[PDB]
Amino acid sequence: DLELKKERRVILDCERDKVNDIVDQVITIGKHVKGYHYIIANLGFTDGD
Amino acid sequence: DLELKKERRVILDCERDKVNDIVDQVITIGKHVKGYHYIIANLGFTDGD
Ligand SMILES: *[C@@H]1O[C@H](CO)[C@@H](O[C@@H]2O[C@H](CO)[C@@H](O)[C@H](O)[C@H]2NC(C)=O)[C@H](O)[C@H]1NC(C)=O
Prior knowledge:
Chains A, B: This is Glutamate receptor 2. The structure is cut from a larger assembly and holds two copies of chain A. By secondary structure, chain A is an alpha+beta fold.
């Protein structure tokens, strides 16, 4: 449904466990190539993988 | 080096241990979006992940 508006840009605001799950599902569906953008809205940006 | 001639279609002739490593590295570098074609050149096609 995010591809309906052709969203090239998503800001993620989740906890230290949900960020890893969303990034793993994005990697599974393949939406991390050059052409998109992401912002991990937390203080521990290096805490995730 | 495979992006020099803009190679789109790659045949993987590897055993059941190296195919999973090549697929994991493709997913890590992000080259499994729509536009590329791959052939798992073996007999146990459903053996890999
Ligand atoms: C990566 O971040 C930049 C912002 O620093 C995004 O915008 C680019 O900004 C540079 C300026 O340093 C321009 O020269 C580029 O033309 C801009 N990109 C575009 C597409 O216009 C850039 O979009 C980001 N990358 C992605 C894939 O979103």
